[PDB]
Amino acid sequence: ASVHGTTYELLRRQGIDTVFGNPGSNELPFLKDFPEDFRYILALQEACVVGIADGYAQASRKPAFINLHSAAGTGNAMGALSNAWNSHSPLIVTAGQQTRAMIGVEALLTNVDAANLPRPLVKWSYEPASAAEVPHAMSRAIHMASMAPQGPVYLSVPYDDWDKDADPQSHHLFDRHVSSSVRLNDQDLDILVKALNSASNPAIVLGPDVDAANANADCVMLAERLKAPVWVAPSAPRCPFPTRHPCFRGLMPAGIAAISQLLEGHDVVLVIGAPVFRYHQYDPGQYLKPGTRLISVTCDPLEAARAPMGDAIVADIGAMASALANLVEESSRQLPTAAPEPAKVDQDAGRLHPETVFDTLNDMAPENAIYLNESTSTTAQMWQRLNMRNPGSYYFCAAGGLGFALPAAIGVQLAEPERQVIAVIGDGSANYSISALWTAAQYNIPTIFVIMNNGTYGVLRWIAGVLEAENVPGLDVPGIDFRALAKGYGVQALKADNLEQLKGSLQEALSAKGPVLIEVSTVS
Amino acid sequence: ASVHGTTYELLRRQGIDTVFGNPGSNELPFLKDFPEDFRYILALQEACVVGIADGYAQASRKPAFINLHSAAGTGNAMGALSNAWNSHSPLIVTAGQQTRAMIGVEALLTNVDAANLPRPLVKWSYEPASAAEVPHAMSRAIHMASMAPQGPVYLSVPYDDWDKDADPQSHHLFDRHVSSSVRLNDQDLDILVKALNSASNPAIVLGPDVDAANANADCVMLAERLKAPVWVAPSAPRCPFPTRHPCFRGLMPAGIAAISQLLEGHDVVLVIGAPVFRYHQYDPGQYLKPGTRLISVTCDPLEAARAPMGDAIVADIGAMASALANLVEESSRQLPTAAPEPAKVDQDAGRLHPETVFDTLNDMAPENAIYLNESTSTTAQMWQRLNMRNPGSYYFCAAGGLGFALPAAIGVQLAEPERQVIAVIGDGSANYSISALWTAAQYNIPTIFVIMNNGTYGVLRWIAGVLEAENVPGLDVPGIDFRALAKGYGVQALKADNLEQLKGSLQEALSAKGPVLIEVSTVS
Amino acid sequence: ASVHGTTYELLRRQGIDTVFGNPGSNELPFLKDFPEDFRYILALQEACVVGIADGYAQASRKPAFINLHSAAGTGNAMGALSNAWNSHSPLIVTAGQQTRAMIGVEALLTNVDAANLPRPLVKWSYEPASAAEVPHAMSRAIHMASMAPQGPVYLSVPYDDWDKDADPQSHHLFDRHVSSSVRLNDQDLDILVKALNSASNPAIVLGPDVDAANANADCVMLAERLKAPVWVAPSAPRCPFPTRHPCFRGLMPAGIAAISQLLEGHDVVLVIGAPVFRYHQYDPGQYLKPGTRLISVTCDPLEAARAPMGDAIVADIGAMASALANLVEESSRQLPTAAPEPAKVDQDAGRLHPETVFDTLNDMAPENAIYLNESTSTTAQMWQRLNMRNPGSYYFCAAGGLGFALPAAIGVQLAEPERQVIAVIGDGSANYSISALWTAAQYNIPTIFVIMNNGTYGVLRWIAGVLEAENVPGLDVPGIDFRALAKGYGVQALKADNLEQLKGSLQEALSAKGPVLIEVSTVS
């Protein structure tokens, strides 16, 4: 068998059936004879390729496979890899290299020192030393991406390797099963359970690895048993809990002092599937107030090591959440009271308040909708105003890197064809990966894109105001016609300049057979 | 509190009480006011510092703390770090940096791009961005070294940071407990146990992480229940099993074909705490024969990913071994029969056969002796001829890097004062870290060093013969007087030119109050 | 032709005829059939291998070739590479890798991520992607080491590559000539010359790249024409000027304030072949006083970029020094007056003051002796007391990393068989690379080693005193018998406990046919 044939068999045997890519000449020898049982999803720029694959992997809860062109294609994707690292997304990134005989002279298209290029944003990065090693290296890539803590990996392959003979002993790779589905030993788990049972006023904080593990329902059971309020850890990339459950308390503010104040009076705080903590703003103060003990369950040693406080347990989130939910006592304390509905912001017949947009989406969208957020000044209101009952209902760029949501929404919609995906994206953010729209058109992936157009990088104007920073350039983005961009890439386009038009456009979009972009005029 | 005071409190609260070091000026501000409850162990060269610390960590089963001088001191230690990486040794390597104000001009003693220097041989490598970050960075280092899979880490600290004010909130670091003591979830563990119970002819292969976890006794129980032969995985850095137990089958040859042949007819092979596999010689063939399934339990994702065959489970070796030993059925098959005693090699009244040396050590040494091996042509015979009943009884350079055993034997002896340490070291290997002898003299650490003097790099002459490689330079090392080297560093020195003298010298050495070196004339 | 044959032909055609090495199994396929016209120089540890090669390269003013064993051998050499980087030493470091078929499984002796291992201490680091690339990669290594700014490079070669067929077109590599012998364009050079001619009170500062270029005599002419005092730049790795020439002003103190004060009143300061500046101690103040302009000529862009003051010209030191010396006007100012002889320190009949040792060496040594310094508390006095008339007469560890001088003195003596090499090494420093002594014995390289034994890391005790740092551990090194160490490695050993014995021992050493070590009892 050839390296080509062996590698595709390995991929198929390991459950991979889709290649997200933007092709080049170093990749043609890999892409030729493309298997009839695989799908290729083309995107027009590599940030888009990786974003689509990332959304697909996150929503499918399985690895996604990417093929890019040498250094320039890899390089174009590195912002996307920054997000993927923070979301623990299991992405297998392959890039074609020059033929081995031309690497030394650094022919055009040589990826120099290739494995160093994507560092430090990958778990493993490698170029094999021979053609017959390629299937083994691919096996390593698959497993490295997939083991806890999941994350992106990189493999560079000289284009002449594909046609060479494989090692017949590579067949042992095909059916390897590698598990990291582990949990704390019984003795120490019993100690933890007793500490949770004995707590007088426990709180729970959940992060994105809960949703990645589909541990959401187990966390609901845990919170109900402990009668504990539940927060989502700051800078949330996913939604780990039903947002109208009585225990839910919303998104934690991403500040040191704000979080210790919120946790004051809680004697034990159990954090599951989050860094401790993904703070953002400068908000100096105490990590915890006196009287609060924190215990973190994380899938990632790097998270456990860097927490500035608390105990930690490094284990699989699904296995731990299930074990805890089934072991803790039913507390006789009263169940927390649900948060009240948010206020309705006064809305005239003109430009839309973001609150109006979210309220309207919540009213009109199906109960199993999936939302993506890249409307950076409106996140708090989004979190208050969308009732997200189900797992996998929210994504936000995990490293804060713009250009995620537009392509990722396409990948999520591909992963979840029965769930309507609605991406709410600022006018600034929309440009970073605008060409991703074409993939939705070409493959008829019926994502709805809601562009919040206020003409500016609004959160940056806000921060500049707080900082008292005057004379900052580059914060306004006037003069972008998003309906024309949508037409450019073949996506149906609507506008909404007021609430009546918003409702009309959403009605049209929800019933459409293809992707739709709605340009919403929002308050500036 | 100062950064100095806070950092030493963190170290003490995390169980560190010893600093292995070779000082320099960038380290004086750290070493000043050295705490009265800490011990400093000086060695004369940094390979020696790290080797001593490594032996101490491996034998104590706890992290060891190292302080080196900038780039040159770190650099001198990098061969030692190569071994430490392969043995999963929990080493916290700190190095002093220039004062922050002089780093930009690259003053003498500046460690340029410091965190990259020890890569790729460390789990984590870092220089903090401010003085007040130093205690937090130290906390990260401690936990990164200590979490499974354990390994060396590196922290560079500008010398002016120590006297600066610490963050008062660093007190939250002091008592953090971080656990990776995890095992496979119950459902999947029950599947594994059923597969072991159903095997008709199981075999067990054990690696160094078993001995590191002190899982040896649990593995004895497991092997007895399964009635299974037990091998030690190739290139063994430690001894994971009693070598005269009836199930023991010795050291696996480090070749692909040799191992698949050895495992032929075993339907399930359970590998615990080893890479799959640390092959060495070129010995192409099948990874496994038809009819053999392999299942690996490893603490290291990198091991699980790179195995060319078998299933894998990534979990703590101690937790897994205990769980398996207590869950499997007692097989009604007959217990394996003990290996017979090895043959006595004919020995005249002249130079010693290595077999004679090992037989004599086995006769005369206490039953709780600890052996180190850096006698590279004699490893197979050593493994056959030493009855090692207890855990922690054997160490061999885990990356094959010479210069480990001489210093490591000192660190092991420091860790285990009641167990006589005997390092068996070739005349070639003895030179790499010869100055370590001084530390044994200075601190009166009563290690016995047995120098096997045959005048040559014997295993290289052997390999050159197999390869039919003629005219190879540099394989002979005549003209070294090891008794004079021992005198040079203040260690009592004996010679043994024949068996009678070997017995006499060993008798003297075993009853000595300090370290002793015996130069043995072995067959060439 | 094989890769082996082609590579050795390339080496020979590029002027390489010596391999400095410590062998291992990955290197046996390279070392077999070793060419009869090459020499192999064995050393017993890799810091020693690289130090010997470094001294040889520095003194010969040509590249030196090194062969080490995989990661552990490379790692043992990294402290030596730290010095080599700072001295711009043209070292071609090769290391053997596992056979390509075993790299993926990380067999024992695999150098993982090999090219990253020696970073950041090499100019270029590489592992070829195929066997036929090896000769081209070797060509790249040779030229990268040799082009200005010279420095160490690293090449990792899988052991199976050597026996493979080479590309016949590799013959084009053999006779390539690559020049960096460049100087500033005429127009801008004329501007510089006019600025030097117009200076009222010029000063010259010279660094190690002057001695490396053998630009010393041109710098003498330049200083004589300009009637300018001449200093050696701080932390000097080499001696660039005759130390009793009337213009010579000695070693600059390695402090910011001290240097600007020394240069005060000099209107133009011309720095040639030095960083600006290799400061050491914290000595904050002005980089230059008002009225001083600095102009630097450096072979190294990294030096030019990081200078905190002055103009810079990046060019070959030999070409620039010759051009300037021949273009400047003869100033009618008076030639500077020679420094007076240093004082004689009172010396009783007991332990030796270091000043006494240097005065005695200066009296008794030949006028073409070559000195190496690793006696760290005595450098200032050494510089004042040795009359070094000729180029290539002084070496000191360029990164401050101990373990350089003992092996480097052997390499210098090998390079310069007619010039007596005398290494003056502290008792602390002597241990780092003590096994290098064996190479001097084995090859009968007649270096004289003068061990300054004061029982302590003296400069560290001194600095601790200045810092007012109390309770510092690890600063004393009692109990080392250097005559026994010398006997251990087959080197003739003498002692000197007082001046009469020093003179007697030096007389014996200077007339000896082989290497000699003299242990001198110096004041503590």
Ligand SMILES: Cc1ncc(C[n+]2csc(CCOP(=O)(O)OP(=O)(O)O)c2C)c(N)n1
């Ligand atoms: C790749 C990338 N570049 C720049 C930024 C900085 N950034 C953060 S938010 C923001 C403004 C986004 O504006 P918009 O999407 O219109 O949302 P608004 O703040 O107006 O709600 C910018 C540029 C970033 N996070 N990522």
Ligand SMILES: Cc1ncc(C[n+]2csc(CCOP(=O)(O)OP(=O)(O)O)c2C)c(N)n1
């Ligand atoms: C740091 C380092 N350098 C070189 C080697 C290569 N090496 C492997 S075994 C060996 C010979 C050791 O000789 P000796 O200790 O006398 O034992 P013998 O083979 O004679 O039993 C050498 C040099 C290595 N493994 N590590």
Ligand SMILES: Cc1ncc(C[n+]2csc(CCOP(=O)(O)OP(=O)(O)O)c2C)c(N)n1
């Ligand atoms: C590899 C290395 N480790 C440690 C140091 C720190 N160091 C600088 S000077 C010095 C003391 C050397 O003592 P010695 O050679 O006896 O000379 P003395 O200071 O007594 O004159 C030490 C350990 C270093 N520069 N390089």
Ligand SMILES: [Ca+2]
């Ligand atoms: Ca509503």
Ligand SMILES: [Ca+2]
């Ligand atoms: Ca799906």
Ligand SMILES: [Ca+2]
């Ligand atoms: Ca906006």
Ligand SMILES: [Ca+2]
């Ligand atoms: Ca016996």
Ligand SMILES: [Ca+2]
């Ligand atoms: Ca102990």
Ligand SMILES: [Ca+2]
């Ligand atoms: Ca030997």
Ligand SMILES: [Ca+2]
């Ligand atoms: Ca004199």
Ligand SMILES: [Ca+2]
């Ligand atoms: Ca010469």
Ligand SMILES: [Ca+2]
């Ligand atoms: Ca000294």
Ligand SMILES: [Mg+2]
């Ligand atoms: Mg990079």
Ligand SMILES: [Mg+2]
């Ligand atoms: Mg293959």
Ligand SMILES: [Mg+2]
């Ligand atoms: Mg258990």
Ligand SMILES: [Mg+2]
């Ligand atoms: Mg490195």
